[PDB]
Structures are given as C-alpha cells and as structure tokens.
Amino acid sequence: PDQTWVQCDACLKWRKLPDGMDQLPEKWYCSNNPDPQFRNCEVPEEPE
C-alpha cells in the first residue's frame, strides 16, 4: 500500500499520513496532522 502525503496549504511542506484516511478537508494545514511531531509549519519536511 502506497505512502500517502498531504501538502500544508500554508508552508507547502509535505506530511506523511497513515493509510486509513480519505475524507480530508479542502484545505489542510500542519496543525491538522494526526502525527503530533509534525503538527506545525516549523518542523522540517521528512525526507522521501
């Protein structure tokens, strides 16, 4: 199963998401991340 990533509409960094989730909102921000260690725009983007 592929790794899904979502782009923060503010900082444009890509954040990994767990497999479970379609049904994302139209706009998405780091602050919405289920992973609490990647939940603001200051955290660097994880390497691919």
């Binding site: 592929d2 790794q3 899904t4 990533w5 979502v6 509409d9 890509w14 998401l17 994302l24 139209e26």
Partner: peptide, 8 residues
C-alpha cells in the same frame, strides 16, 4: 487537500 503517493 493536495495529496501525492509514493511507493513503500
């Protein structure tokens, strides 16, 4: 939201 997919 804008998404992408990469192979594991």
């Amino acid at each position: 939201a804008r998404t992408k997919q990469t192979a594991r």
